[PDB]
Amino acid sequence: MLCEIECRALSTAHTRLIHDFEPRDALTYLEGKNIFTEDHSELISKMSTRLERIANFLRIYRRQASELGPLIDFFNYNNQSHLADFLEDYIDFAINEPDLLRPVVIAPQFSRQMLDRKLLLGNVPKQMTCYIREYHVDRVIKKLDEMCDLDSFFLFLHGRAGSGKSVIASQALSKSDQLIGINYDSIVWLKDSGTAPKSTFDLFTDILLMLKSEDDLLNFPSVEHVTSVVLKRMICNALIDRPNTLFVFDDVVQEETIRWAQELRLRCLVTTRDV
Amino acid sequence: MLCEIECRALSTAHTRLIHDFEPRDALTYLEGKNIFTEDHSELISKMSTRLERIANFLRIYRRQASELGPLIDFFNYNNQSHLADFLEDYIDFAINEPDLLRPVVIAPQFSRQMLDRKLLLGNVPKQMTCYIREYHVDRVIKKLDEMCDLDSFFLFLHGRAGSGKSVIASQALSKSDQLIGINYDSIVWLKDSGTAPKSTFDLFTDILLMLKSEDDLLNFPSVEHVTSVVLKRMICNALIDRPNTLFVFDDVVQEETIRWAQELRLRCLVTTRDVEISNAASQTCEFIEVTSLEIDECYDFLEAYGMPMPVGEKEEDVLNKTIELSSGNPATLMMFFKSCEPKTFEKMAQLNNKLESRGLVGVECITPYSYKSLAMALQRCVEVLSDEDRSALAFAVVMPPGVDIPVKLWSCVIPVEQLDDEVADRLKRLSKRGALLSGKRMPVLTFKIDHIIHMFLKHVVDAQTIANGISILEQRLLEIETVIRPEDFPKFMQLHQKFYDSL
Amino acid sequence: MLCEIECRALSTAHTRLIHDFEPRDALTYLEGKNIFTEDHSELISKMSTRLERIANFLRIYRRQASELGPLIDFFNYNNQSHLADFLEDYIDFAINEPDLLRPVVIAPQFSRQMLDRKLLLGNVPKQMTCYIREYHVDRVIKKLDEMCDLDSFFLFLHGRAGSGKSVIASQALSKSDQLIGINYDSIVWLKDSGTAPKSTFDLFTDILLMLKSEDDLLNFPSVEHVTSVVLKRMICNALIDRPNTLFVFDDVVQEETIRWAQELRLRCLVTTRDVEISNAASQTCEFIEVTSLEIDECYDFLEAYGMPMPVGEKEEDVLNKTIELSSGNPATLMMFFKSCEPKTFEKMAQLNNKLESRGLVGVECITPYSYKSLAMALQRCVEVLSDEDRSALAFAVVMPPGVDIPVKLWSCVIPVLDDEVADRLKRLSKRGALLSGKRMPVLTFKIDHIIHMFLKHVVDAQTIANGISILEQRLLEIETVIRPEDFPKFMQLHQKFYDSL
Ligand SMILES: Nc1ncnc2c1ncn2[C@@H]1O[C@H](COP(=O)(O)OP(=O)(O)OP(=O)(O)O)[C@@H](O)[C@H]1O
Ligand SMILES: Nc1ncnc2c1ncn2[C@@H]1O[C@H](COP(=O)(O)OP(=O)(O)OP(=O)(O)O)[C@@H](O)[C@H]1O
Ligand SMILES: Nc1ncnc2c1ncn2[C@@H]1O[C@H](COP(=O)(O)OP(=O)(O)OP(=O)(O)O)[C@@H](O)[C@H]1O
Ligand SMILES: [Mg+2]
Ligand SMILES: [Mg+2]
Ligand SMILES: [Mg+2]
């Protein structure tokens, strides 16, 4: 197999590999340098359009070669050297230097991305604006940054009632552009307020659905009736597709919540009154 | 069908079969060498993602082939020989040269981030960090390593209640990188705590689902209604796709569990309080007892959680009072800390009092324990007790705790010819079953009740039955230090007048 | 059509027919030698990949040719002679010699195959290891080997309760590698224990599912509601895919089971306590009785489980007391060990007492047995008993155990020429082996101790004393030696073993 660098190259130089190229031209040269099979060449060789032969050549290729050699050593011979030169240039601006791009910005306006889009979908409330508690929103954000490294952790933003804890979580996830995108990929903000004994399970029913794709909210089953061991397994399942995901649990009253959060190895911001 | 070796290989070499491979490529070569069917290839050939075609190819394959030949003889032809070479290497470090498989072909792919994936999915709890019981977590891991070879086996991590067994399994499967990946492929950790007769079946309903693929949890049927013979057959079925899989059964109370585990030929770690559930298994049973925390370990545990270490002599004593009271007990010790508020040696001694005049309820607190106080736990240990044994225990209140005392001196308070060995038989069952007592063969057959196991009974038995047992003692009490009490001096239990007047 | 030899060749030489070959090359040569059709060549000739043209050439070919000639006579002409030579070599190492491979081993480690895999899926229990009854597990296996030839047959591994029958079936199918793989292809081991009339049908519901593929356990219908004629037809249907399949029916109580087993033409191992269920079958019935553990085997069994062997004379005696008491019995013996706590010859003798003054309940313990004590088992063996026979048994309390005693001496306590007594006492040993028949010197039976302290703490405390009096009445009116008819007037020899009531 290749990797992200070698596959990012076949993708970046894609506007070009469409204007002038042909997989039939390379099939003979690759059945040869030992990177194909007589079904492989059959599959890519009998394709009505070229974008088909190209998409199959780039799919099949990324699996077969130990490296990106026998494709630079081909655009050369095929009078398509303006191609093998671009790709060799790209492999060099990474092979000879240990520095690139980090998680940052090169397609700007995270203003609808990190803001709008991710906040809204994670059910984060519309941050307060006319006064901001400097000290606190800052210290929250700081201690969250320190932890994006951690595998699972609790942050307790605890206080008096109406003391203002929940508003600060709104602001701490709404000021920076780092917490969402840079430090954590997604946000899930759920209000608890559970008092009944069925509440600590019902909560995690609506997490599981905060997770599930826009598709298959239709298929949402009578999950209403299914054991705790299963909702839990069913969640940490659907939780693979969610790299670094933050959980705000606005208003926890029951420590059973907290026990579930720790069985589910979650990353949690927690507003509560009882510490 | 394949087996655990041939299926453990398809699983070990899985990080790889995902990066470069395709079941469509192999379908033609296998409809051919006679190992598939025209529905088989249909089922794996029309699948949107490849991880689907791969998981179906590896599921369908493990059932169909008499061996793992026609898949090495394919990665070769498909220019994916870096694959068929790895698998042929693995099949060779098993038949000819044994042992060498784990050091050589299994370890060079360990990854401290893959464990966590496997731990989480096997529902393993978040191992403890601020103090680790060296000795035990080590010895657990050791005896598990010795057995990955074995086909099915029971490991009994048995102890007192709140004695800390379950935490150690969290750590023993969380320290090394060997137990998961090297010695066993996957983990399934399920909490039992079953009391009903439907519980031993319900357990194995949630195993079966601990096994089943992320796919077809949707299709999960009303399996809720289906015989025991079928859930059992249905499991050992879906158990093929699981080469070397470990089972932690946190908190077994019923020996029916243990009988199912042995019909299902499972590999089991077992935390329990009652040790005799092992008599259900006619098999490789090996044991590790979680003892009361030694006096030195208690210090370590205290320091670890910011607890101030002594200086003055009547301060190391304030702390020997806590260690004596919570007769070396993880769970109640923890409840103590959470409740030691100011941290002072002073407020630490305040509590030492609260413990004598309120039993365990003086320090009951919100703790990582499912239980507010050790009394909520022991409740159960006492319900399960033989009706006759429930009686024996109930009277052992009126003893001296932390004192080694003769059988006859016990024959006096305990209910029931001329030989009262029957007392001893009950007292053994009594230490075997929640470790409520304490047996000690020579110099002379004597038992002993600790303090945690005492202030339990103090604030729990009928206020009357305490005083009735005391009188029932002062009767037999007459009729004709590192030293046990002699038979010339039983007439006077008065040595412990101190620890008797406080009733 | 070809056959297994000629098709095994096209398969063995397959790694090769993929590296260099082409069905287009042979189509013309075969449309010719009369072995194809102009659709055949169309079907194999228009195929994108070659593994397609090859798999269709080898599928289509195996059906069409009377033999494997016109394919050796082709790799020759096609410069692929290194192929037609390999296949002609293979056809010769079978045509010129009458010997090959048998059902055996050439892909080794049946240790997960025959063992693990087939045993587990047939729901066979985890064989015992720390002691093996040599004689028996061996004789079981032997008589099973003799029969893999047979089309359907019953093997009755019958004995006392807790006498150890089921464990031996675990071992007899777990020692060898022959019984599973060599003699029989698969195993189905099902526990019966059926008492209701719906039980003999419910059993066969779970056979049918022991048979059904891993696929379509999902499709399992409400088979719960469907006639007996259909479950039966539905089974012997799904039973085609199962060449030489063995059935262990652990614990049959009802002879209706046995009638179904014989309508379904099954091959059955059968553990049971009541032996007469075999009269239900008009057939090859062969039997193996699990006797009480001989005195020497008891020693072996004790040592095997860390039990201390005698020295002093009144210590081998302490141990002959246990062996006498648990009148040689696997299950109650095991309960003893689990309960022998300190291991001392002393605490061993403590228990020897507890047994006389509390019956089997003195040593009841958690054991690999489904039962706390042998009394929980025997319960059933007694319920099943003919209403009249339940009576006969109930009185045999008032006998001397471990004593060979005459029929007339029994005619005294038993309800009703009194041969009728003997008839009941036979039914009684046949049906749970509660008694013990012994033809000459004179027709005498005998009750063991385990089969006694059962009745001791179980029959009406009154009926014991009433039978004793009912005896002292008839007792008058006119060692390796049986009691003579000149001396029946005095059952007083056993005053010792009588005063203890
Ligand atoms: N800029 C602000 N910062 C903090 N609190 C504010 C601000 N503006 C208004 N508030 C008051 O706080 C209310 C919401 O309080 P908030 O939810 O922050 O407290 P809380 O800690 O969540 O209380 P709870 O104990 O109910 O969780 C607002 O609607 C208003 O009454
Ligand atoms: N190594 C440890 N570090 C910190 N706390 C511990 C440790 N061992 C035990 N405890 C205390 O005991 C509680 C859980 O005890 P644990 O579950 O380990 O005992 P247990 O033997 O499983 O009891 P049970 O058999 O009832 O499950 C924890 O909340 C903690 O308070
Ligand atoms: N190695 C052994 N061989 C024979 N019996 C044993 C052995 N070890 C233990 N036993 C005793 O036999 C018990 C199981 O008895 P078993 O099931 O063999 O008798 P059985 O003939 O099946 O009785 P049933 O009449 O109930 O069918 C064991 O759990 C134990 O009590
Ligand atoms: Mg709020
Ligand atoms: Mg626990
Ligand atoms: Mg049985």
From Swiss-Prot, chain B:
User: What result follows from mutating residue 233 to E?
Assistant: Severe reduction in the number of cell corpses in embryos in a ced-1 mutant background
| Outcome of swapping residue 230 to D | Loss of dimerization without affecting interaction with ced-9, loss of ced-3 activation and severe reduction in the number of cell corpses in embryos in a ced-1 mutant background
A GO cellular-component term linked to this record: nucleus
Q: Which residues bind ATP?
A: 131, 162, 164-167, 273, 367, 369
- Major localization listed first in the record, in broad terms: mitochondrion
The CARD domain extends over 1-91
One of its GO biological process terms is:
embryonic morphogenesis
Q: What InterPro entries has UniProt attached to this entry? A: CARD, CED4_WHD, DEATH-like_dom_sf, NB-ARC, P-loop_NTPase, WH-like_DNA-bd_sf, WH_DNA-bd_sf
Describe the effect of residue 258 to N.
In n1948; no effect on the interaction with mac-1
The molecular function terms of the Gene Ontology recorded here are: ADP binding; ATP binding; BH1 domain binding; BH3 domain binding; caspase binding; cysteine-type endopeptidase activator activity; cysteine-type endopeptidase activator activity involved in apoptotic process; endopeptidase activator activity
Task: Give the top-rank taxon of the lineage listed in the UniProt record for this protein.
Answer: Eukaryota
Tell me the keywords, alphabetical order.
Apoptosis, ATP-binding, Cytoplasm, Magnesium, Metal-binding, Mitochondrion, Nucleotide-binding
Domain (NB-ARC): residue spans on this chain: 133-416
When the coding gene is removed by deletion, what phenotypic consequences does the entry describe? Mutants exhibit a block in almost all programmed cell deaths that normally occur during development. RNAi-mediated knockdown causes a defect in egg laying in a small proportion of animals. Also causes a moderate increase in CEP neuron survival in response to high Al(3+) levels. In an ain-1 mutant background, enhances the proportion of animals arrested at the larval stage, with egg-laying defects and with a ruptured vulva.
Q: Which residues bind Mg(2+)?
A: 166
**Localization annotation:** Mitochondrion; Cytoplasm, Perinuclear region
Q: Which PANTHER family does this UniProt record tie to the protein?
A: APOPTOTIC PROTEASE-ACTIVATING FACTOR 1 (PTHR22845:SF5)
Tell me, what does this protein do in biology?
Answer: Component of the egl-1, ced-9, ced-4 and ced-3 apoptotic signaling cascade required for the initiation of programmed cell death in cells fated to die during embryonic and postembryonic development. During oogenesis, required for germline apoptosis downstream of ced-9 and upstream of ced-3 but independently of egl-1. May regulate germline apoptosis in response to DNA damage, probably downstream of let-60/ras and mpk-1 pathway. Regulates CEP neuron apoptosis in response to high Al(3+) levels.
Q: Subunit structure, briefly?
A: Associates as an asymmetric homodimer with ced-9. Only one ced-4 molecule within the dimer interacts directly with ced-9. Upon release from ced-9, forms a multimer, known as the apoptosome, and interacts with ced-3; the interaction results in ced-3 autoproteolytic cleavage and activation. Multiple oligomeric states of the apoptosome are observed including hexamers, heptamers and octamers. The hexamers likely represent a pre-mature state of the apoptosome and may contribute to the regulation of ced-3 activation.
Protein name (record): Cell death protein 4
This chain's source organism reads: Caenorhabditis elegans
Q: What is the lineage of its organism?
A: Eukaryota, Metazoa, Ecdysozoa, Nematoda, Chromadorea
The record's gene field reads ced-4
